Amino acid sequence: VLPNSSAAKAGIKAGDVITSLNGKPISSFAALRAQVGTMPVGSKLTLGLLRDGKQVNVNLELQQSSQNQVDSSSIFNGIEGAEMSNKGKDQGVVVNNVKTGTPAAQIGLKKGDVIIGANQQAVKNIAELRKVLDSKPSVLALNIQRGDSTIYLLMQ
């Protein structure tokens, strides 16, 4: 269980065995992954445990992801391979993960980048980013920052 996780906050310990979701038995781990991967954030559900031969029921609530929240694709409509999320309070979009051999790493994106602005407009969250991509500019000038440096990366 990760720290500050709803499971940790709900009282779920490692080494446990999940058996049911909302009463419906679980067929596998991969099936449950797909079940909850579609439920909206904050969806309240109940789970069934089996620890030391003892059945446990827990109420839980979906949370957001500070790690690997939004992948690149759904923003650019053609550029995949960069999982990214917001930083702090409107402090930019840090890239959590970059895949080897994907269209994102093909332009130079690495882990740890922090995007501050793009095309003369300061960028604070994924909405402000998407607010420029809907404008569909011919070329994109990203005022990102890697470490203590202020750099740029270009598109198209």
Binding site: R33, V36, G37, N68
Partner: peptide, 5 residues
Amino acid sequence: CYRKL
């Protein structure tokens, strides 16, 4: 191989 929910 453990994956994240």
